[PDB]
Design a protein around this ligand. Sequence first.
Ligand SMILES: *[C@@H]1O[C@H](CO)[C@@H](O[C@@H]2O[C@H](CO)[C@@H](O[C@@H]3O[C@H](CO[C@H]4O[C@H](CO)[C@@H](O)[C@H](O)[C@@H]4O)[C@@H](O)[C@H](O[C@H]4O[C@H](CO)[C@@H](O)[C@H](O)[C@@H]4O[C@H]4O[C@H](CO)[C@@H](O)[C@H](O)[C@@H]4O[C@H]4O[C@H](CO)[C@@H](O)[C@H](O)[C@@H]4O)[C@@H]3O)[C@H](O)[C@H]2NC(C)=O)[C@H](O)[C@H]1NC(C)=O
Ligand SMILES: *[C@@H]1O[C@H](CO)[C@@H](O[C@@H]2O[C@H](CO)[C@@H](O[C@@H]3O[C@H](CO)[C@@H](O)[C@H](O[C@H]4O[C@H](CO)[C@@H](O)[C@H](O)[C@@H]4O)[C@@H]3O)[C@H](O)[C@H]2NC(C)=O)[C@H](O)[C@H]1NC(C)=O
Ligand SMILES: *[C@@H]1O[C@H](CO)[C@@H](O[C@@H]2O[C@H](CO)[C@@H](O[C@@H]3O[C@H](CO[C@H]4O[C@H](CO)[C@@H](O)[C@H](O)[C@@H]4O)[C@@H](O)[C@H](O)[C@@H]3O)[C@H](O)[C@H]2NC(C)=O)[C@H](O)[C@H]1NC(C)=O
Ligand SMILES: *[C@@H]1O[C@H](CO)[C@@H](O[C@@H]2O[C@H](CO)[C@@H](O[C@@H]3O[C@H](CO)[C@@H](O)[C@H](O)[C@@H]3O)[C@H](O)[C@H]2NC(C)=O)[C@H](O)[C@H]1NC(C)=O
Ligand SMILES: *[C@@H]1O[C@H](CO)[C@@H](O[C@@H]2O[C@H](CO)[C@@H](O[C@@H]3O[C@H](CO)[C@@H](O)[C@H](O)[C@@H]3O)[C@H](O)[C@H]2NC(C)=O)[C@H](O)[C@H]1NC(C)=O
Ligand SMILES: *[C@@H]1O[C@H](CO)[C@@H](O[C@@H]2O[C@H](CO)[C@@H](O[C@@H]3O[C@H](CO)[C@@H](O)[C@H](O)[C@@H]3O)[C@H](O)[C@H]2NC(C)=O)[C@H](O)[C@H]1NC(C)=O
Ligand SMILES: *[C@@H]1O[C@H](CO)[C@@H](O[C@@H]2O[C@H](CO)[C@@H](O[C@@H]3O[C@H](CO)[C@@H](O)[C@H](O)[C@@H]3O)[C@H](O)[C@H]2NC(C)=O)[C@H](O)[C@H]1NC(C)=O
Ligand SMILES: *[C@@H]1O[C@H](CO)[C@@H](O[C@@H]2O[C@H](CO)[C@@H](O)[C@H](O)[C@H]2NC(C)=O)[C@H](O)[C@H]1NC(C)=O
Ligand SMILES: *[C@@H]1O[C@H](CO)[C@@H](O[C@@H]2O[C@H](CO)[C@@H](O)[C@H](O)[C@H]2NC(C)=O)[C@H](O)[C@H]1NC(C)=O
Ligand SMILES: *[C@@H]1O[C@H](CO)[C@@H](O[C@@H]2O[C@H](CO)[C@@H](O)[C@H](O)[C@H]2NC(C)=O)[C@H](O)[C@H]1NC(C)=O
Ligand SMILES: *[C@@H]1O[C@H](CO)[C@@H](O[C@@H]2O[C@H](CO)[C@@H](O)[C@H](O)[C@H]2NC(C)=O)[C@H](O)[C@H]1NC(C)=O
Ligand SMILES: *[C@@H]1O[C@H](CO)[C@@H](O)[C@H](O)[C@H]1NC(C)=O
Ligand SMILES: *[C@@H]1O[C@H](CO)[C@@H](O)[C@H](O)[C@H]1NC(C)=O
Ligand SMILES: *[C@@H]1O[C@H](CO)[C@@H](O)[C@H](O)[C@H]1NC(C)=O
Ligand SMILES: *[C@@H]1O[C@H](CO)[C@@H](O)[C@H](O)[C@H]1NC(C)=O
Ligand SMILES: *[C@@H]1O[C@H](CO)[C@@H](O)[C@H](O)[C@H]1NC(C)=O
Ligand SMILES: *[C@@H]1O[C@H](CO)[C@@H](O)[C@H](O)[C@H]1NC(C)=O
Ligand SMILES: *[C@@H]1O[C@H](CO)[C@@H](O)[C@H](O)[C@H]1NC(C)=O
Ligand SMILES: *[C@@H]1O[C@H](CO)[C@@H](O)[C@H](O)[C@H]1NC(C)=O
Ligand SMILES: *[C@@H]1O[C@H](CO)[C@@H](O)[C@H](O)[C@H]1NC(C)=O
Ligand SMILES: *[C@@H]1O[C@H](CO)[C@@H](O)[C@H](O)[C@H]1NC(C)=O
Ligand SMILES: *[C@@H]1O[C@H](CO)[C@@H](O)[C@H](O)[C@H]1NC(C)=O
Ligand SMILES: *[C@@H]1O[C@H](CO)[C@@H](O)[C@H](O)[C@H]1NC(C)=O
Ligand SMILES: *[C@@H]1O[C@H](CO)[C@@H](O)[C@H](O)[C@H]1NC(C)=O
Lengths: 136, 136, 136, 389
Amino acid sequence: LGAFILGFLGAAGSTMGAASMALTVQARLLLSGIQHMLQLTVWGIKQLQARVLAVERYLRDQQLLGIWGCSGKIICCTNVPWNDSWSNKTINEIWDNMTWMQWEKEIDNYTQHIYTLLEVSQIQQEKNEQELLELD
Amino acid sequence: LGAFILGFLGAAGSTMGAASMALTVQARLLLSGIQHMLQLTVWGIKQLQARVLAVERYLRDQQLLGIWGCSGKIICCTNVPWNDSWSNKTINEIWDNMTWMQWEKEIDNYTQHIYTLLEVSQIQQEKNEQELLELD
Amino acid sequence: LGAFILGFLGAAGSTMGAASMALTVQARLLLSGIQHMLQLTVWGIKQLQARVLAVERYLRDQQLLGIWGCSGKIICCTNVPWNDSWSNKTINEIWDNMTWMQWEKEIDNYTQHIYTLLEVSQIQQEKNEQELLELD
Amino acid sequence: AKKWVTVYYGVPVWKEATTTLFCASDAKAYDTEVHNVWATHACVPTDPNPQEIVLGNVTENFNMWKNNMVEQMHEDIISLWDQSLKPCVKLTPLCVTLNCLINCNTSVITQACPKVSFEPIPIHYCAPAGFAILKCNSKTFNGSGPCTNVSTVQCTHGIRPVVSTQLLLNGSLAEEEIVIRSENITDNAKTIIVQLNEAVEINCTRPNNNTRKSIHINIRQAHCNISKARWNETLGQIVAKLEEQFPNKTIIFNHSSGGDPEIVTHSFNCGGEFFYCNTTPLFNSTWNNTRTDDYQNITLQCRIKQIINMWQGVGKAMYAPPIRGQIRCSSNITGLLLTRDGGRDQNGTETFRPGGGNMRDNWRSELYKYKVVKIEPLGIAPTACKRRV
Ligand SMILES: *[C@@H]1O[C@H](CO)[C@@H](O[C@@H]2O[C@H](CO)[C@@H](O[C@@H]3O[C@H](CO[C@H]4O[C@H](CO)[C@@H](O)[C@H](O)[C@@H]4O)[C@@H](O)[C@H](O[C@H]4O[C@H](CO)[C@@H](O)[C@H](O)[C@@H]4O[C@H]4O[C@H](CO)[C@@H](O)[C@H](O)[C@@H]4O[C@H]4O[C@H](CO)[C@@H](O)[C@H](O)[C@@H]4O)[C@@H]3O)[C@H](O)[C@H]2NC(C)=O)[C@H](O)[C@H]1NC(C)=O
Ligand SMILES: *[C@@H]1O[C@H](CO)[C@@H](O[C@@H]2O[C@H](CO)[C@@H](O[C@@H]3O[C@H](CO)[C@@H](O)[C@H](O[C@H]4O[C@H](CO)[C@@H](O)[C@H](O)[C@@H]4O)[C@@H]3O)[C@H](O)[C@H]2NC(C)=O)[C@H](O)[C@H]1NC(C)=O
Ligand SMILES: *[C@@H]1O[C@H](CO)[C@@H](O[C@@H]2O[C@H](CO)[C@@H](O[C@@H]3O[C@H](CO[C@H]4O[C@H](CO)[C@@H](O)[C@H](O)[C@@H]4O)[C@@H](O)[C@H](O)[C@@H]3O)[C@H](O)[C@H]2NC(C)=O)[C@H](O)[C@H]1NC(C)=O
Ligand SMILES: *[C@@H]1O[C@H](CO)[C@@H](O[C@@H]2O[C@H](CO)[C@@H](O[C@@H]3O[C@H](CO)[C@@H](O)[C@H](O)[C@@H]3O)[C@H](O)[C@H]2NC(C)=O)[C@H](O)[C@H]1NC(C)=O
Ligand SMILES: *[C@@H]1O[C@H](CO)[C@@H](O[C@@H]2O[C@H](CO)[C@@H](O[C@@H]3O[C@H](CO)[C@@H](O)[C@H](O)[C@@H]3O)[C@H](O)[C@H]2NC(C)=O)[C@H](O)[C@H]1NC(C)=O
Ligand SMILES: *[C@@H]1O[C@H](CO)[C@@H](O[C@@H]2O[C@H](CO)[C@@H](O[C@@H]3O[C@H](CO)[C@@H](O)[C@H](O)[C@@H]3O)[C@H](O)[C@H]2NC(C)=O)[C@H](O)[C@H]1NC(C)=O
Ligand SMILES: *[C@@H]1O[C@H](CO)[C@@H](O[C@@H]2O[C@H](CO)[C@@H](O[C@@H]3O[C@H](CO)[C@@H](O)[C@H](O)[C@@H]3O)[C@H](O)[C@H]2NC(C)=O)[C@H](O)[C@H]1NC(C)=O
Ligand SMILES: *[C@@H]1O[C@H](CO)[C@@H](O[C@@H]2O[C@H](CO)[C@@H](O)[C@H](O)[C@H]2NC(C)=O)[C@H](O)[C@H]1NC(C)=O
Ligand SMILES: *[C@@H]1O[C@H](CO)[C@@H](O[C@@H]2O[C@H](CO)[C@@H](O)[C@H](O)[C@H]2NC(C)=O)[C@H](O)[C@H]1NC(C)=O
Ligand SMILES: *[C@@H]1O[C@H](CO)[C@@H](O[C@@H]2O[C@H](CO)[C@@H](O)[C@H](O)[C@H]2NC(C)=O)[C@H](O)[C@H]1NC(C)=O
Ligand SMILES: *[C@@H]1O[C@H](CO)[C@@H](O[C@@H]2O[C@H](CO)[C@@H](O)[C@H](O)[C@H]2NC(C)=O)[C@H](O)[C@H]1NC(C)=O
Ligand SMILES: *[C@@H]1O[C@H](CO)[C@@H](O)[C@H](O)[C@H]1NC(C)=O
Ligand SMILES: *[C@@H]1O[C@H](CO)[C@@H](O)[C@H](O)[C@H]1NC(C)=O
Ligand SMILES: *[C@@H]1O[C@H](CO)[C@@H](O)[C@H](O)[C@H]1NC(C)=O
Ligand SMILES: *[C@@H]1O[C@H](CO)[C@@H](O)[C@H](O)[C@H]1NC(C)=O
Ligand SMILES: *[C@@H]1O[C@H](CO)[C@@H](O)[C@H](O)[C@H]1NC(C)=O
Ligand SMILES: *[C@@H]1O[C@H](CO)[C@@H](O)[C@H](O)[C@H]1NC(C)=O
Ligand SMILES: *[C@@H]1O[C@H](CO)[C@@H](O)[C@H](O)[C@H]1NC(C)=O
Ligand SMILES: *[C@@H]1O[C@H](CO)[C@@H](O)[C@H](O)[C@H]1NC(C)=O
Ligand SMILES: *[C@@H]1O[C@H](CO)[C@@H](O)[C@H](O)[C@H]1NC(C)=O
Ligand SMILES: *[C@@H]1O[C@H](CO)[C@@H](O)[C@H](O)[C@H]1NC(C)=O
Ligand SMILES: *[C@@H]1O[C@H](CO)[C@@H](O)[C@H](O)[C@H]1NC(C)=O
Ligand SMILES: *[C@@H]1O[C@H](CO)[C@@H](O)[C@H](O)[C@H]1NC(C)=O
Ligand SMILES: *[C@@H]1O[C@H](CO)[C@@H](O)[C@H](O)[C@H]1NC(C)=O
């Protein structure tokens, strides 16, 4: 929906807050429901391999988010506190300014570090759940 | 399974109770596991574009049900009380008589109103969950 | 990933423990992101019908696991106690030795019986949840 | 107990779509036939393995006069006639937006007129990706009435684009009995479509033998023959059905009541020959339970014309002179378009004059069995569960 098959959370160029708020408007609307040539075959397949690969990649990463406890959810939520040495910005200016392409370059240094913190936090929630299994 | 790719919850013409009960029988069975021409190509693609579009529509609406807290579930359950000015019928006759095509015309007047109630109830559950986050 | 589209939990021949532990290594890696002929058309479709059918079968069984309360999860967990008359083996030798093809022949006699126990346990959890709905 | 609303998914629910349908006809791509040239550039090959899924105990209100699918075929045929028979002089009206002496000056177009071959080909309208086509199977179907043997398909049956008036040519026949269809009877405005259950044949020729161009300062003559011993049987069943709608009155057929020459007479085409066949010795007879014809070869006098009135909008046209000789039309007759003359002067009679002219009514007699529907999968129903919060 965001000019490609992937990247459907919003269109590029719009800020993070304006895109996420516009998605809900697109959510209620889409849910309520209110010449030829023989060489069209080759391009009929090239348009299918891009759609099958985008779906097959979607289901793979949708299941790979089980490492962080965010399986099957496009917008998850964790319990890892946000450092101040990463961005040092308020939640108001991050969502009102700084679109997705600009925000990626802002935390590209630490985007590989945060992936390590999310997995350690998941094992802790699983181990703490296992300890309660001894009682219940 | 219900004569089309979509509409797989049951076949039309059967009542809502008889179709939902027959699905479970089809569930246990499917889970336990117990001449040519060159112009077959064009129809080989037309049979694929109907299958890729049905899957791509499935995954879209499956994720769009997150507005009501029913993401990833084909049979959800909410906490909105059912009005009596909508149908005024018992749960026995609705499922034993009145197939899906007949039931749709029964509540077509209010099927646009109920969508507004489900979203308001979801934001309330999310806000009430956020208030407990201040404590836990 | 396990030499086919399905069977992606691991490659055959490796033991159950070595395959499940190697999947997590493949999980972090894939998530962090660190001549022609006109008769290529017919084989371009045969390679698509195997991918669309594998995805369409995936989504069907992924939703059919709702009978056991394991909907949308590739690795579920139940609460049915494991009998000793089924395998009579420790959890260490089952995962260190006995690959998936060998383990299937080990419990092929009771693999049809265990499916009956999982469904009865699900209805019990649903009924016990319904009894608490009278209170809450 | 305590009802609660729940949302389902994948619920069988239908609606009505307004989409486009791609055609699918068995072309040739090599001959100089017009329809084979058109079908090659915009149509796909026919489905070799069709699948008709029979639904269960379903009922659908198949309205036929409000069908939007026939509004598409009519716009897909007009685009074929602009690629087949190019007129020498296409005189068409054109007005100017001036309130009221409105400026309405004609706009003529001069194009080359090559005499091309002409023969229809059965096409199949298929549903696009994401929609489905329903199909009734009742042997009567009544028209805008709900049937019960509804089955879904993906492509319709063989449909020929034949353009004719007063007698529906080549096409599908009825299943078991001659049925009549009309949007509303007793209002003498809607045409009554009559479908036959037996193919009545017709042969129309002019071998050579009439090279006499003018008379004073014939090549413009042709004829047709109808098997009287076979045609009376099918007409004898039509009056048996019409009297079931009006038992006390008298069925009296008649010729046309006048108007344009494409309505007063029959009009069909065969290789650019626009036969205007006088049909008065076929509807002159008055009727009752007994016959009033005679007692084999009913000479239906025809005539090739050159200045016609287009059916694809207002405006005359002018084509090239006819071919030298050997023009044959081995047709069939599957339908019949009949109007009705009612009123306060109707003293126990029933007049059924031949009508037709509206080509949309020509295809509604063919696309009556289908309907394009989409599948809406959401659904809401009350139940006894409750989301644990
Ligand atoms: C309802 O459905 C029915 C079908 O069930 C429809 O009936 C069809 O109607 C068609 C037209 O009315 C008719 O088509 C004609 O068929 C003729 C015979 O075909 C057979 O012979 C040919 C040749 O041997 C075979 O190849 C073929 O397989 C058949 O077996 C054709 O000969 C006709 O073509 C000629 O006429 C058209 C008319 O415009 C010309 O455009 C075309 O180019 C041909 O013209 C030549 O012949 C005419 C005849 O006099 C000449 O005047 C003209 O100058 C051309 O002459 C040259 O060529 C000849 C050799 O052919 C040569 O001797 C001469 O010297 C010149 O060099 C035409 O194709 C279908 O047969 C008929 N189908 C059936 C089953 O009966 C019916 O129409 C439908 N209803 C409606 C309203 O459409
Ligand atoms: C098929 O439909 C046609 C429709 O045109 C119909 O033909 C006409 O029917 C009318 C109705 O009867 C005829 O009109 C009358 O016919 C009588 C009999 O000849 C005449 O005498 C009448 O003329 C006198 O009366 C008029 C007032 O009524 C005066 O104004 C007039 O000056 C005369 O004094 C009157 O015309 C009409 O003649 C026919 N025409 C033809 C060509 O038949 C036909 O009857 C229908 N077919 C069947 C089988 O019913
Ligand atoms: C299917 O078609 C039928 C005809 O093709 C439709 O039938 C119509 O049905 C209505 C309902 O009865 C008739 O209307 C009547 O008209 C008379 C005459 O009106 C004159 O007199 C009144 C005063 O009496 C005056 O006010 C008027 O101006 C007229 O001068 C009325 O008296 C009646 O009350 C009634 O309104 C039509 O006459 C009739 N059509 C014909 C051609 O006879 C039928 O409705 C169609 N089906 C559907 C479902 O719509
Ligand atoms: C309700 O609609 C269905 C639509 O398919 C009807 O089924 C069809 O019935 C006809 C009989 O009129 C079958 O034709 C016969 O086919 C058999 C086998 O092919 C052949 O032996 C006969 O010579 C005849 O051609 C037709 O095949 C069948 N459709 C299918 C898909 O099998 C059904 O009859 C309708 N119900 C009523 C009461 O009319
Ligand atoms: C179709 O063919 C029929 C063949 O009967 C044509 O009917 C005949 O048409 C002529 C020409 O008008 C009629 O002759 C006229 O008769 C009246 C008397 O009513 C006379 O006053 C006139 O001077 C003239 O002679 C003839 O009566 C009529 N036949 C019958 C039985 O009424 C018809 O005109 C043809 N129509 C077309 C569109 O080709
Ligand atoms: C309505 O039109 C039909 C068209 O067929 C008329 O039937 C035709 O009636 C004429 C009467 O003159 C028949 O002619 C007869 O021919 C035989 C043999 O040559 C002769 O012995 C008789 O004396 C008479 O002339 C003609 O054959 C017949 N058509 C057919 C195909 O048989 C009918 O008369 C018309 N009715 C009215 C009221 O105009
Ligand atoms: C009523 O109309 C039909 C057709 O409009 C007439 O049938 C035609 O009759 C002629 C005379 O016999 C047939 O010609 C012959 O055909 C055979 C077979 O090819 C041929 O070997 C002979 O040398 C001769 O040419 C003609 O084929 C036939 N039409 C058709 C389509 O078969 C019929 O004669 C008419 N009735 C009367 C009483 O005239
Ligand atoms: C055949 O079609 C007619 C209309 O074309 C249907 O007629 C109407 O039917 C309803 C209910 O069946 C009645 O309330 C109307 O009064 C009828 N109107 C007329 C003018 O007859 C008829 O129902 C159809 N037949 C079947 C079996 O459904
Ligand atoms: C119209 O012409 C067709 C053929 O062009 C005739 O059909 C033939 O009729 C004879 C009987 O006279 C049969 O023996 C033949 O077998 C028929 N042909 C075929 C292919 O089956 C038809 O009879 C003619 N009809 C009229 C009214 O002229
Ligand atoms: C159409 O009908 C006419 C009228 O019957 C046929 O003309 C007759 O043809 C036969 C044999 O060809 C002759 O014996 C008759 O004398 C003819 N009648 C007249 C009045 O001339 C004509 O042949 C038929 N058309 C075809 C193609 O057969
Ligand atoms: C016109 O009518 C004739 C019969 O009068 C049709 O010929 C039949 O065609 C079907 C099609 O397969 C055959 O099964 C029959 O055996 C044929 N019968 C005869 C007597 O030939 C002819 O198809 C019709 N024309 C059109 C265009 O439908
Ligand atoms: C993030 O905050 C934690 C607080 O527990 C701190 O120990 C850590 O050094 C911070 N990260 C960086 C890169 O400074
Ligand atoms: C970093 O955080 C400190 C403490 O909130 C703040 O005073 C300072 O302005 C921030 N600097 C930048 C560059 O964001
Ligand atoms: C966006 O950034 C500008 C500075 O470029 C700042 O002045 C503005 O306040 C920011 N927007 C919001 C809503 O704070
Ligand atoms: C972050 O990465 C950019 C380029 O990717 C580099 O220029 C910058 O110095 C890096 N900053 C840190 C703190 O690593
Ligand atoms: C549904 O029930 C509520 C009870 O809280 C009531 O206030 C409301 O008016 C009802 N809805 C309608 C449309 O009557
Ligand atoms: C279904 O409806 C009929 C009325 O047509 C009623 O008599 C019957 O009791 C209903 N079915 C059940 C199970 O109540
Ligand atoms: C509900 O919709 C139907 C059409 O299905 C209409 O006839 C009816 O008047 C509507 N009722 C209300 C209260 O809007
Ligand atoms: C499995 O264990 C249960 C104990 O709850 C026992 O009663 C049952 O017989 C065992 N199953 C078999 C097949 O021995
Ligand atoms: C695997 O099986 C062998 C017997 O073939 C046994 O000796 C060995 O201890 C088993 N592996 C482990 C890790 O126990
Ligand atoms: C289990 O199945 C195998 C082959 O399927 C058979 O040889 C064996 O006897 C069976 N054992 C039992 C206890 O049914
Ligand atoms: C349709 O009704 C008949 C009536 O007995 C019934 O036997 C049949 O099962 C029904 N169709 C379906 C699909 O249930
Ligand atoms: C119709 O004509 C045929 C001869 O072609 C004859 O056998 C039949 O009896 C006629 N029909 C009637 C009702 O007289
Ligand atoms: C029409 O036929 C009936 C008998 O079927 C007869 O009573 C009636 O008088 C006839 N009509 C005329 C005008 O003779």
